[PDB]
Amino acid sequence: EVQLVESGGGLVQPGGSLRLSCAASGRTFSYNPMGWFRQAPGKGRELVAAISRTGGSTYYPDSVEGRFTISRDNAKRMVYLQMNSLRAEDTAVYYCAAAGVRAEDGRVRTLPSEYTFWGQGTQVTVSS
Amino acid sequence: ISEPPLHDFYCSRLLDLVFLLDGSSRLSEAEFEVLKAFVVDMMERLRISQKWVRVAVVEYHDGSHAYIGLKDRKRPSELRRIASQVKYAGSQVASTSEVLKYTLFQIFSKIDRPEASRIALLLMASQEPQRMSRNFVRYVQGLKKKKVIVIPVGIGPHANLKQIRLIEKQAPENKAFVLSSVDELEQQRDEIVSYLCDLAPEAPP
Fold first, then answer.
1. Which residues are CB-contacts of B1 (< 8 A; sequence separation ≥ 6)?
2. Which of B25, B18, B141, B1 is nearest to B69 (CA)?
3. CB–CB of B168/B174 below 8 Å?
4. CB A121 within 8 A of CB A5
5. Residues of A whose CB is below 8 A from B202
6. What CATH number corresponds to the domain at position A91?
7. Domain boundaries, chain B
8. What region holds the VWFA domain (chain B) (predicted)?
9. In this complex, do B12 and A74 lie within 8 Å of one another by their Cβ atoms?
10. Are A105 and B9 in contact (CB < 8 Å)?
């Protein structure tokens, strides 16, 4: 139905910067609300960033306000995670997801169970 | 591919949707402009394509003036511009019986898209002469047999409630919205487009 492909992960210096890309494809793709999640060593999946269908609305947990900007370009069927002033704890596998529950409503989605389609993951390691 | 969503709400389903606009003087020129705006807002909240939502726009007086057919392969922005430029008729009569016959024999003469739901959004402000209603139930029954859902929207105190209730009787998905005026259309828009979207399937290919 929906295929999501993350790219652009790698190693960075603490306080460094990194842009993640996600290429969305498939017939049923309708510019769904999207979200970036992560799994850090020994931890559950965390939503770090969510965006409405149009991009006019965004959600980040207070913990990461100022360190992540989610954006999207619907003409290219892309979504992005700008990572800024990176820390040790930002080391994790980063997943791009899309809401398939009531897709017609393109408002930002914070409930992780409403995210239905998932990419393969991209590793970000913040080290020396 | 071609043209991204204008709003957060965006119906990506298999739907043949027909907008039927009362052309009688029961609406002022200014009230008719409000009706077209509602139609253009609706169109902006649909994924318009031969694969997803197909739209038709007809204005009805004692006859039917089609401006867009379901099959007209044009750019959504072009289709919406056409809808915004439908002319005020301000006619003496608007015949629900005639525009339902047109929809039955001219729009839904054959079912290209059995995979899609088919919807007639009958936007009513007036009451046709009782001489013109001879075959009214016949044509609604003909639409129920072609699996066309008729959704009557009565606008204002002159809309024919007898006929709206009649349409609801003839079939259970046939469901009505009774509005006190055109200004209520914008209030009611999000509920209406949500209802229309839910009657349709997500790609059952």
1. none
2. B18
3. yes
4. no
5. 28, 103
6. 2.60.40.10
7. 1-205
8. 16-192
9. no
10. yes
